[PDB]
Amino acid sequence: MTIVEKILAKASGKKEVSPGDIVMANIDVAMVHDITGPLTVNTLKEYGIEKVWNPEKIVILFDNHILMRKFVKEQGIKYFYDIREGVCHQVLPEKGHVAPGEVVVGADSHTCTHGAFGAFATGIGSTDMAHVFATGKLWFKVPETIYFNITGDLQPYVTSKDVILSIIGEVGVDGATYKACQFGGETVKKMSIASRMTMTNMAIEMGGKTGIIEPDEKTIQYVKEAMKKHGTERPFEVIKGDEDAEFAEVYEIEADKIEPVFACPHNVDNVKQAREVAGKPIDQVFIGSCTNGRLEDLRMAIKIIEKHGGIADDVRVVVTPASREEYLKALKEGIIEKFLKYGCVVTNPSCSACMGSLYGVLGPGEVCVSTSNRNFRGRQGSLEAEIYLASPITAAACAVKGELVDPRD
Ligand SMILES: [Zn+2]
Incomplete structure (x- = not known):
């Protein structure tokens, strides 16, 4: 049973899960940014729910504007950031909203980035997001991990970008489609969290559902530091894959012979x-x-x-x-x-x-x-x-x- 699977198992409240299996998982954090916020709100009530499930598990982005102010104010939503924290995904883990063994959903396609933190992270549409806002749960077709085992040392002038670009280059824009790309090995454990974000970010460029990387204490240090800095502190467990798990299309990449690419x-x-x-x-x-x-x-x-x-x-x-x-x-x-x-x-x-x-x-x-x-x-x-x-x-x-x-x- 893979890491994505143990995550979905704990989240759904099942004690076992298989790929293709379909479960209802509890969401740790949901994020909305530009158009999807207003859409999600209107879509949210033409239905009739007046309370979001957990006003502290929703993260929204700000700078018509009016519906969104009034929404965050009417709800108890604590975490709302201005667009001058930066336009990227960086904000969400930066403030400690992404912890290992968590289920993270966002409006943007590249939410998969946060898979770098050993969490199951996906972009979802507006209706799905409306359901999440309402019930704090969502349906997931349990994917399959395709494991990329990357071992060896990166040569000078060679970065995780060259690595992931090479991987993409031998797997094509598809894929890696209905499947989760999991990166591991010594070369992965050696690179920095930033460098991991680089890869997990580009997972969906292979058509992948999400990228994910197993946590270690770089991950832990990062998350804990961010949590204490922004007061987003909360307990988490470190969920890591078992050798009892199997993978469609295990690849093997050796970072030795990887050289700068385009x-x-x-x-x-x-x-x-x-x-x-x-x-x-x-x-x-x-x-x-x-x-x-x-x-x-x-x-x-x-x-x-x-x-x-x-x-x-x-x-x-x-x-x-x-x-x-x-x-x-x-x-x-x-x-x-x-x-x-x-x-x-x-x-x-x-x-x-x-x-x-x-x-x-x-x-x-x-x-x-x-x-x-x-x-x-x-x-x-x-x-x-x-x-x-x-x-x-x-x-x-x-x-x-x-x-x-x-x-x-
Ligand atoms: Zn300026």
């Missing part, structure tokens, strides 16, 4: 190695995202840039910390100013002037190296623009030379 334009899953496509000129580099937007990413990228002393002219470098906290960390550490001084522009996620700038919008015939999730046509701009995906290191290197690279050159 997700080449319009599709995430093609994934050609850096050397092959190297040399093509680029007019923009986008560093930071929900995928790699955290402190370690900024740190390695600015390290690369700094060592070679600045960026190529006639290239637009855009640096976007995943959240306000991450931004403040990078600020306090001098990283933000190093970026600024080298000619990059940094978007302060709490600044509307920063957030509304069109400076990073790709025009026709423009090439961009991005550290984000998605390279499909028209994503960052014109549909006649193309987008390569990379780790912060590879991206930084591209910003240094001003065309497509392999970080070691």
